[PDB]
Design a protein around this ligand. Structure first.
Ligand code: CDL
Ligand code: CDL
Ligand code: WUO
Ligand code: WUO
Ligand code: MQ9
Ligand code: HEC
Ligand code: HEC
Ligand code: 9XX
Ligand code: PLM
Ligand code: PLM
Lengths: 223, 149, 51, 25
């Protein structure tokens, strides 16, 4: 659709030339080339709000998006027309697929996530720190399409898992585990962040020991 | 500390299978070879496609592409290989694209994973790219089922 | 009874029995043995490793 | 101290040959 292409370029000119160039070749030491990244990379980077970036640092953080769904599609089509690349999955009505990406085998997705993702995102997608100022953000806010596009395009330091390394059905199983492990309530009480022993030791010292010492004060005497 | 002149985000390369190259004044982006494979090698005589996008850094004049050569075979250029003033020249039509093409007639076998040198000349600079082979949006080829051992 | 020799050759390799710490799954059991780089499919049983 | 059996080399190296595989497991 020529309407979608010129809208995407018109949006691109006033938002993405300073760092990516007018012809999407990239600006050295300011931004890489966008040729061949595909519509999937643009969808993830804009819908997650990661782009447009504001400065150079260790890692560009997520923030509220600067464009809506229609403008994201226009921007994706413009970049897609220059070099091709992967595309975001879509449903029957042509909208971005969200529910249809939920796989039916969460047990397989859990093993795949623990093999391929747990290392950077933690047992239950709570996030993890990387080498120098970089980190794997918590996965509780990404919709299934965003997780699929992140696995497809491999943003920043995340590996670019291809449809051959991880088949569409394997990706759907992984996002099913990601979506369910974030929406599953804790069974033994308050989750304490799900980070493991570190919050557990902090909670003990600040709650149980404080109560135990406070009770000891009430029963015992001073001086 | 991480926001100084040496920044991790600013120097990052695109997460694509292509190769960036500087041919004097023309920017070669997403340079890759399309070659479906069946065995350990793509035998000589097979016709593969070389795909890339040429970006004109200059905005005053025009440029034209000539004489793509490599030690893997002969490269044939079909179409108007001229890049506009401040535009792009898309050579090849990759997957996900709803006509300049680079046709390579192989002389020696090639395989995915290695690098093969290609030479680009426009009018003002000749550079070598060491082009890789990139499978695009093609699905994973089936693997024969293993027996019980 | 608890004491065990770490370097008793118990692992069959291409050049005789070797200690456990000197070997791994990638140590050839005979000359010219083909060891594939297999990927874990994530499903228990029914080909967990494929080429 | 540094590990004696860990030194960088300047030799370029060659492309590995295609694997054949010997019989008789
Ligand atoms: C989200 C995480 C949050 C983490 C924190 C939560 C941890 C939970 C543990 C709760 C602690 C339970 C211990 C209380 C024992 C009950 C004692 C009682 O009945 O009162 C008599 C007791 C005095 O009796 P006494 O020993 O005869 O008095 C001798 C002197 O007069 C004593 O006089 P003094 O001159 O020696 O000093 C008096 C001192 C006495 O206060 C203390 O000693 C309590 C401080 C506890 C810290 C213990 C370890 C300190 C390490 C740091 O008071 C203060 O100076 C500050 C206390 C302020 C009251 C706290 C308000 C609660 C709001 C919480 C929100 O008064 C208190 O200590 C009342 C404290 C009120 C606690 C509220 C209960 C909390 C329940 C919520 C649970 C969740
Ligand atoms: C001791 C065993 C602890 C039992 C549980 C403590 C709960 C408090 C109970 C209470 O207030 O009852 C009243 C009780 C006295 O009531 P009483 O019945 O009249 O006692 C009769 C005696 O005459 C009482 O004799 P006193 O009052 O002459 O002696 C009490 C006090 C007298 O204190 C001293 O002798 C000098 C104070 C030393 C402070 C150290 C400097 C801190 C580093 C600054 C760095 C800047 C950042 O002794 C201490 O504070 C000794 C413990 C020193 C630990 C310091 C660790 C700091 C390292 C963290 C750096 C990061 O007060 C205390 O004993 C105060 C407890 C001190 C707090 C514990 C240390 C907390 C360490 C964690 C810090 C968190 C890191 C962040
Ligand atoms: C005598 C003493 C003995 C008594 C001791 C007992 C004390 C314990 C009291 C509390 C018990 C509660 C029982 C109910 C348990 C429950 O049913 O649980 C509900 C759910 O709730 C959370 O779901 C959130 C959402 O609902 C989800 O939608 C959302 O997804 C999820 O997000 C996670 O998941 C996402 C991916 O999905 C990630 O993206 C994301 O990042 C994150 O991980 C959310 O979770 P989260 O943000 O963790 O916190 C949210 C918390 C907000 O925090 C908190 O509670 C903080 C407060 C408690 C925590 C522990 C203390 C911390 C101590 C530290 C040491 C502090 C540091 C100090 C430093 C100093 C020293 C250092 C040197 O809001 C609340 O609940 C509000 C409730 C507040 C109630 C207060 C109690 C009132 C007491 C009054 C008593 C009166 C008595 C008077 C007598 C006279 C998760 O847990 C779920 O699993 C869990 O299922
Ligand atoms: C008087 C009291 C206090 C006084 C202090 C105030 C003044 C201090 C002045 C310091 C200078 C400020 C400059 C800031 C700007 C800056 O920094 O930008 C420079 C660039 O530098 C790095 O690039 C390097 C190149 O430019 C690149 O070309 C190159 O490639 C790259 O090479 C790395 O990277 C490559 C990847 O490409 C790899 O290939 C390669 O191998 C390698 O790893 C380079 O990197 P690297 O060597 O890391 O150097 C980084 C910085 C280093 O930072 C710093 O200042 C570090 C901060 C030190 C401060 C001291 C601590 C004080 C503690 C408290 C005071 C104690 C409490 C007191 C107690 C109470 C009092 C009681 C009495 O060097 C410098 O600036 C020079 C340092 C000189 C400072 C001298 C101070 C020493 C202390 C003396 C005190 C004496 C006191 C005695 C009293 C009697 C990158 O960061 C770039 O992005 C960045 O852009
Ligand atoms: C190697 C090593 C020791 C590393 C630490 C280095 C380091 C710089 C530590 C602290 C740095 C911090 C706190 C950065 C924030 C920026 C900042 C404000 C700096 C301090 C400025 C300053 C000194 C002046 C202000 C005055 C002052 C002293 C106030 C600061 C007080 C605060 C907020 C300190 C807390 C810091 C700290 C280390 C505490 C973490 C405690 C732990 C173990 C938390 C684990 C934990 C987590 C992570 C949960 O997710 C969770 C979820 C649900 C329930 C519980 C928890 C829980 O406890
Ligand atoms: C400079 C401050 C930038 C602006 C403005 C925009 N982008 Fe950007 N982008 C920038 C950097 C330094 C990087 C690389 C590291 C990173 O944070 O990811 C990027 C990355 C992208 C990508 C991913 C490329 C990949 O290899 O797949 C995309 C798709 C992208 N940027 C698009 C984009 C768009 C559409 C922008 C306008 C809204 C935009 N960027 C602004 C730097 C900067
Ligand atoms: C470490 C090397 C990682 C591995 C392995 C995986 N992920 Fe990751 N992921 C990593 C980083 C550093 C980032 C942030 C990149 C950015 O451009 O800002 C991400 C991002 C994601 C996201 C987006 C999350 C959002 O903010 O909502 C998702 C959904 C995600 N990662 C999922 C994911 C999955 C399913 C993985 C297994 C295949 C996986 N990641 C691996 C770091 C790393
Ligand atoms: C735990 C126990 C630690 C036991 C150490 C036993 C040291 C045996 C060194 C033999 C050798 O050949 O080393 C070659 C070296 C690699 O090459 C060099 O150049 C020499 C560097 C010198 C460094 C001195 C360090 C002293 C440490 C002690 C003083 C502190 C602990 C007591
Ligand atoms: C006294 C503090 C001076 C800070 C100077 C360095 C500024 C960049 C740090 C961030 O990044
Ligand atoms: C007690 C501290 C001793 C420090 C010795 C450091 C030796 C470094 C050797 C390396 O190699």
């Amino acid at each position: 659709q020529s309407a979608l292409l010129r809208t995407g370029k018109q949006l691109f000119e006033t938002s993405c030339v300073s760092c990516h160039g007018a012809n999407l070749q990239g600006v050295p030491d300011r931004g890489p080339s966008l040729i061949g990244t595909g519509e999937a990379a643009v969808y993830f980077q804009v819908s997650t709000g990661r782009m447009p970036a504001m400065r150079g640092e260790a890692q560009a953080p997520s923030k509220p998006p600067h464009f809506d769904e229609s403008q994201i599609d226009a921007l994706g089509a413009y970049v897609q027309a220059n070099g091709g690349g992967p595309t975001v999955p879509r449903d029957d009505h042509g909208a971005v697929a969200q529910e249809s990406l939920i796989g039916g085998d969460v047990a397989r997705g859990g093993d795949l996530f623990r093999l391929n993702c747990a290392s950077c995102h933690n047992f239950t997608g709570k996030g993890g720190a990387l080498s120098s100022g970089k980190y794997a953000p918590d996965l509780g806010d990404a919709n299934p399409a965003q997780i699929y596009t992140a696995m497809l395009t491999g943003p920043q330091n995340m590996p670019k898992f291809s449809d051959r390394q991880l088949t569409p059905d394997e990706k759907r199983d992984i996002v099913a585990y990601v979506r369910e492990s974030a929406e599953t309530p804790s069974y033994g009480g308050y989750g304490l962040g799900g980070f493991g022993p570190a919050p557990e030791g902090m909670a003990m010292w600040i709650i149980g020991m404080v109560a135990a010492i406070g009770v000891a004060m009430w029963i015992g005497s001073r001086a | 500390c991480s926001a100084g002149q040496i920044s991790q985000t600013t120097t990052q390369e695109p997460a694509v299978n292509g190769v960036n190259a500087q041919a004097g004044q023309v920017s070669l982006r997403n340079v890759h070879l399309r070659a479906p494979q069946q065995t350990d090698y793509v035998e000589p005589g097979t016709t593969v496609e070389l795909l890339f996008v040429a970006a004109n850094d200059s905005t005053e004049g025009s440029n034209k592409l000539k004489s793509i050569t490599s030690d893997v075979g002969e490269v044939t250029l079909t179409g108007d290989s001229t890049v506009p003033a401040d535009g792009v020249l898309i050579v090849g039509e990759p997957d996900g694209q709803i006509a300049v093409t680079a046709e390579v007639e192989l002389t020696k076998p090639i395989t995915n994973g290695l690098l093969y040198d290609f030479t680009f000349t426009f009018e003002d600079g000749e550079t070598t790219v060491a082009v890789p082979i990139s499978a695009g949006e093609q699905p994973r080829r089936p693997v024969p089922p293993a027996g019980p051992g | 009874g608890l004491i065990k020799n770490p370097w008793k050759p118990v692992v069959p390799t291409a050049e005789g029995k070797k200690a456990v710490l000197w070997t791994s799954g990638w140590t050839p059991r005979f000359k010219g043995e083909t060891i594939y780089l297999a990927r874990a499919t994530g499903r228990p049983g029914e080909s967990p490793f494929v080429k | 101290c540094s590990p004696p059996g860990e030194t960088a080399s300047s030799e370029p190296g060659t492309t590995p040959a295609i694997w054949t595989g010997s019989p008789s497991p």
